[PDB]
Design a protein around this ligand. Structure first.
Ligand SMILES: CCN1CCN(Cc2ccc(-c3cc4c(N[C@H](C)c5ccccc5)ncnc4[nH]3)cc2)CC1
Length: 303
């Protein structure tokens, strides 16, 4: 927070890249698969483009540049970096394509080949990623398996900071307006009085790992997203995943404590899951573990 920032925001024109096919749709704009041939050099790097819907206000235009600022400013193996930005009436955000799609989709598909070593590695990485975002005063606000993308099955990264918010010199929290938010992923305070801290994200981490440990299940399925805070204040919580060791669930439980200050800290979570990563079959019990693959550990980017 004192060194020269020096990030390179590459600005690009809409001729440099063409959209091949759509990946995500929604009122939260459209996101396409495309190719980016930078002006000159004869390379076609495959990218993701997010062409979010037309801005409707100058206030809600200034925030777009903001999402671009940070996404462009971060530098971590497990966090996605903004590759370029295209400033047309409709702003477009260009980013290195993660070809395998999101983790939530990946776990559902290969939900039969995924073994314990992989699951625990993913937890670790996601926490390495978030801890990073913490050492930058950054508050994700939307951690879910849908927002964790797969570069390669052995390497995942966090993405989509549509809601990300920097913290000023003396600031221990963030208060929001009234946009859209995924109640089933939020800490009780977030649902109560729109508060967002790093600890609020930790609760999201837990729901995310829960999502993974259950191979894609919908959290609190069938239960309408209106009375979540009741059951939550009542003390209910997502059930222990069948394959899940008490040792692991107990971490997910600590993550969902009404008291923000009793939830783990990403710093701790890393070391904990890292420890668990060694000797994984002790912490996750999945039929067929002895079988599942391990990670022995036209032109892509990185150029
Ligand atoms: C049976 C599985 N099926 C086909 C394979 N995938 C499809 C898929 C592939 C890639 C992606 C993908 C999205 C994405 C992505 N999207 C995020 C929201 C984004 C962030 C900033 C700018 C643009 C996009 N960013 C980077 N790489 C990405 N890759 C999404 C879905 C899962 C669905």
């Amino acid at each position: 927070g004192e060194a020269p920032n020096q990030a390179l925001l590459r600005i690009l024109k809409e001729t440099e890249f063409k959209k091949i096919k759509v990946l995500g749709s929604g009122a939260f704009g459209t996101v396409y698969k495309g190719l980016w041939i930078p002006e000159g050099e004869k390379v076609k790097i495959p990218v993701a483009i997010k062409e979010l819907r037309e801005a409707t206000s100058p206030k809600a235009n200034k925030e777009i540049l903001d999402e671009a600022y940070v996404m462009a400013s971060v530098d971590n193996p497990h966090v996605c970096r903004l590759l370029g930005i295209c400033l047309t009436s409709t702003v477009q955000l260009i980013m290195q394509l993660m070809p395998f799609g999101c983790l939530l989709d990946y776990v559902r598909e290969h939900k039969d080949n995924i073994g314990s070593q992989y699951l625990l590695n993913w937890c670790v990485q996601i926490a390495k990623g978030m801890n990073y975002l913490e050492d930058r005063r950054l508050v994700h606000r939307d951690l879910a398996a849908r927002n964790v993308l797969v570069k390669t099955p052995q390497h995942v990264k966090i993405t989509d900071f549509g809601l990300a918010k920097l913290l000023g010199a003396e600031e221990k929290e963030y208060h929001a307006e009234g946009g859209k938010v995924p109640i089933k992923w939020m800490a009780l305070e977030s649902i109560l009085h729109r508060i967002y801290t790093h600890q609020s994200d930790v609760w999201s981490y837990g729901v995310t790992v829960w999502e993974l440990m259950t191979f894609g299940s919908k959290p609190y399925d069938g239960i309408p997203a209106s009375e979540i805070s009741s059951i939550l204040e009542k003390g209910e919580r997502l059930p222990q995943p069948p394959i899940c060791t008490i040792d692991v669930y107990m971490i997910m439980v600590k993550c969902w404590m009404i008291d923000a200050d009793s939830r783990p800290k990403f710093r701790e979570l890393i070391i904990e899951f890292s420890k668990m990563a060694r000797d994984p079959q002790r912490y996750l019990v999945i039929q067929g573990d002895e079988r599942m693959h391990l990670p022995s550990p036209v032109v892509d980017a990185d150029e």
